[PDB]
Amino acid sequence: MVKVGINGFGRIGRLVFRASLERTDVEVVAINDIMMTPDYMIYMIKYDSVHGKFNGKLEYTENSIKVNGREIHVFCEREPEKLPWGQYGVEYVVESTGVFTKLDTASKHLKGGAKRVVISAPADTPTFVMGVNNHEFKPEMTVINNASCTTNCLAPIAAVLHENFGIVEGLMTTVHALTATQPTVDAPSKKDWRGGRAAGYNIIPSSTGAAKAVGLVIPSLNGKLTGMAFRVPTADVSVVDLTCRLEKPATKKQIDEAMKKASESERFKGILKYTEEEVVSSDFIHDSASSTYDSKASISLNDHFVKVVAWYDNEWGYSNRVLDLIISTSKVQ
Amino acid sequence: HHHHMVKVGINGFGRIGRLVFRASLERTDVEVVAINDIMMTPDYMIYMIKYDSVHGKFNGKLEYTENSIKVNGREIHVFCEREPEKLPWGQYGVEYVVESTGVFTKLDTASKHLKGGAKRVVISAPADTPTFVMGVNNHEFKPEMTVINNASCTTNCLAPIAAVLHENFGIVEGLMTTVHALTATQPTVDAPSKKDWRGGRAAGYNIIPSSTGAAKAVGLVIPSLNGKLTGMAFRVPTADVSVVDLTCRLEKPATKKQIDEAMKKASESERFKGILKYTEEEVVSSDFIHDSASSTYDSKASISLNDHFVKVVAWYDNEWGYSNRVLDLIISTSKVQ
Numbered sequence: 074m075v076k077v078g079i080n081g082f083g084r085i086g087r088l089v090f091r092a093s094l095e096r097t098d099v100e101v102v103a104i105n106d107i108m109m110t111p112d113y114m115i116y117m118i119k120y121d122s123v124h125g126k127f128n129g130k131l132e133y134t135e136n137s138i139k140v141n142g143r144e145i146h147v148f149c150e151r152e153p154e155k156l157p158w159g160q161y162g163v164e165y166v167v168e169s170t171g172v173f174t175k176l177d178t179a180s181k182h183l184k185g186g187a188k189r190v191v192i193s194a195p196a197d198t199p200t201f202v203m204g205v206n207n208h209e210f211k212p213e214m215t216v217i218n219n220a221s222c223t224t225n226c227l228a229p230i231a232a233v234l235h236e237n238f239g240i241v242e243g244l245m246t247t248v249h250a251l252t253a254t255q256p257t258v259d260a261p262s263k264k265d266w267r268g269g270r271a272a273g274y275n276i277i278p279s280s281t282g283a284a285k286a287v288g289l290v291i292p293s294l295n296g297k298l299t300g301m302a303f304r305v306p307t308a309d310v311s312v313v314d315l316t317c318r319l320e321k322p323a324t325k326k327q328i329d330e331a332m333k334k335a336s337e338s339e340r341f342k343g344i345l346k347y348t349e350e351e352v353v354s355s356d357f358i359h360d361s362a363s364s365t366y367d368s369k370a371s372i373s374l375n376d377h378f379v380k381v382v383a384w385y386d387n388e389w390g391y392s393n394r395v396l397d398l399i400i401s402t403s404k405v406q
Numbered sequence: 407h408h409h410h411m412v413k414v415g416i417n418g419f420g421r422i423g424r425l426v427f428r429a430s431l432e433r434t435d436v437e438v439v440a441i442n443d444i445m446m447t448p449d450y451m452i453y454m455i456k457y458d459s460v461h462g463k464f465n466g467k468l469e470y471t472e473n474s475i476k477v478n479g480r481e482i483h484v485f486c487e488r489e490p491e492k493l494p495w496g497q498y499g500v501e502y503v504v505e506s507t508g509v510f511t512k513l514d515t516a517s518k519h520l521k522g523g524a525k526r527v528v529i530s531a532p533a534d535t536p537t538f539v540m541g542v543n544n545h546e547f548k549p550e551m552t553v554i555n556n557a558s559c560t561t562n563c564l565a566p567i568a569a570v571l572h573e574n575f576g577i578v579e580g581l582m583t584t585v586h587a588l589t590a591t592q593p594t595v596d597a598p599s600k601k602d603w604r605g606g607r608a609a610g611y612n613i614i615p616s617s618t619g620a621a622k623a624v625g626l627v628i629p630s631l632n633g634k635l636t637g638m639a640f641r642v643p644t645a646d647v648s649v650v651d652l653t654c655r656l657e658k659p660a661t662k663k664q665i666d667e668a669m670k671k672a673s674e675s676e677r678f679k680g681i682l683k684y685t686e687e688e689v690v691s692s693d694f695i696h697d698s699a700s701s702t703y704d705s706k707a708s709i710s711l712n713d714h715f716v717k718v719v720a721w722y723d724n725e726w727g728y729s730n731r732v733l734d735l736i737i738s739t740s741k742v743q
């Protein structure tokens with residue numbers, strides 16, 4: 074078992090934790106969050122507005138929680154440099170506070186004896202998408218990141234189109250569920266004015282590096298994609314809308330068959346999924362895929378110009394990929 | 407000199423017909439003198455006119471009688487007929503009838519209003535009649551076209567944008583997405599929708615893929631674009647205001663700055679004034695509530711991958727813009743006899 078510490082017990086931190094309870098090869102042994110105490114922490118585990126109630130046994134002390142009888146240490150430390158991760162045998166720290174997305178600060182987790190760090194967001198570190206480039210990990214890379222939820226949805230789709238038909242150029246939109254960075258009312262957002270507007274009552278254009286980032290995980294696509302986002306009032310589950318020009322001709326049937334084949338390959342099993350059903354966003358709540366290709370919603374203008382639609386639970390799929398990446402890179406020493 | 411004030415009848419006081427009516431109260435180039443409906447009585451009509459969850463309260467005197475309503479002293483006759491051939495529009499001086507039943511789109515069907523005395527009919531939706539978008543092809547109207555339609559709100563947003571791109575740089579091909587506010591055809595809970603399974607799912611709690619013919623229909627108002635665009639929609643939980651997201655390949659190289667200039671110049675032209683607007687501000691959808699443009703180009707949100715491949719973002723109040731375009735089309739075609 075790989076012993077994991079979680080820094081920042083938020084939407085991603087708490088769902089990484091629930092996901093870990095379903096795995097036999099990884100175990101969360103320590104949690105840090107400065108806005109919680111252990112008794113409050115088990116309340117936040119128990120009740121979840123998106124993913125429902127957790128029904129296992131939950132107990133607390135003043136410095137630990139117990140989940141189905143297993144004790145997990147709880148820190149409350151604002152500075153990563155001060156977290157004694159090594160004292161509790163933590164091998165990997167999940168860095169999911171949202172405020173240490175830099176190699177500079179995320180590396181301070183190693184000072185306390187963690188051995189590796191996975192940042193749960195894009196960062197100035199090696200970047201990985203499971204299914205696409207996780208086998209490029211090198212053992213000296215002590216601090217890495219798992220990209221964004223959007224990159225994890227788009228990269229498998231782009232790899233299938235590019236490998237089968239070749240992507241000449243592409244532009245992406247993601248229609249994205251609300252996240253914690255948005256306010257409930259019109260509020261200050263110095264670096265992103267539109268992002269300060271009331272989240273629940275607006276379609277809000279937003280910038281994203283996900284399409285560019287696909288060029289980092291798929292090098293031959295460097296410079297050939299870009300895109301943007303619209304934030305909309307839903308609680309969870311987002312969708313990628315990728316318009317691209319293909320080098321070689323592909324009928325809509327050939328695109329469907331390529332996506333279906335890919336969803337059945339060892340490389341993308343559980344990561345890229347395939348549907349022909351009349352689905353809507355809530356149908357992917359608690360679906361652990363990184364990407365589900367929507368055959369009926371995707372459309373072609375012609376054999377060289379297509380719009381592909383792919384769904385992702387931005388909370389649950391990404392959290393499961395964080396654990397997948399930890400397991401994958403842990404085998405590389 | 408000036409043009410006459412066109413007398414209009416509204417058939418179907420549903421959401422579109424009622425917003426056309428409200429738009430006409432804010433204006434002086436047209437007046438609605440008669441309203442027909444069968445799900446409403448005159449006292450209930452003034453309640454729906456007075457209060458609006460999107461567009462605010464109407465300030466002005468509203469009264470009702472057994473067969474009419476009064477706005478600021480002016481009497482408007484209210485009908486409750488089933489077979490529109492008997493409707494005596496001509497007795498009340500009605501020149502144009504706005505067909506906002508949300509059903510009637512058969513050419514002969516809509517023509518029944520001419521038996522009562524109306525001269526012309528505008529269908530407030532796509533239909534198997536001549537099709538028009540203000541600023542794009544309204545000057546193609548011929549006086550023998552007694553029944554016409556104003557396309558859809560999405561086509562009225564997309565077509566001005568496509569005209570500027572196509573005329574300045576040339577569209578080779580394009581794929582469009584519209585992220586669209588809720589409409590009345592969607593239910594509040596998961597409910598049967600036999601011709602559209604996704605569209606029966608609860609509207610307020612889902613992103614819902616949907617079909618739209620709007621990108622293909624651009625070929626009807628811009629014939630050289632026939633077969634060069636298609637697209638789709640995502641319905642999302644907002645009350646009003648939608649956005650077109652158009653990904654285009656261009657013939658002539660265009661920098662992002664040249665695209666901005668072309669949209670800006672179009673917004674200042676007599677052809678597109680008040681129809682296509684331009685912004686460089688950090689806007690969000692609620693900033694377009696009660697904005698009567700067909701389309702507002704969003705400079706900061708639009709993005710170019712290269713000089714030949716661009717994504718253009720354009721906002722539209724799907725309720726208020728289209729309602730004002732219906733009245734504009736009435737007026738524009740009334741001048742052609």
Ligand SMILES: NC(=O)c1ccc[n+]([C@@H]2O[C@H](COP(=O)([O-])OP(=O)(O)OC[C@H]3O[C@@H](n4cnc5c(N)ncnc54)[C@H](O)[C@@H]3O)[C@@H](O)[C@H]2O)c1
Nearest residue numbers: 081082083084085106107108169170171193194222253387
């Ligand atoms: N929510 C998503 O859909 C999603 C998907 C992929 C990646 N991410 C990324 O993952 C990160 C977390 O996002 P989230 O949505 O879980 O955020 P969140 O606001 O729900 O959680 C952040 C947590 O960090 C805690 N925290 C803040 N500063 C801390 C500190 N100094 N020490 C310890 N704890 C601290 C907060 O109390 C909070 O519980 C962000 O970088 C975000 O961009 C989010």
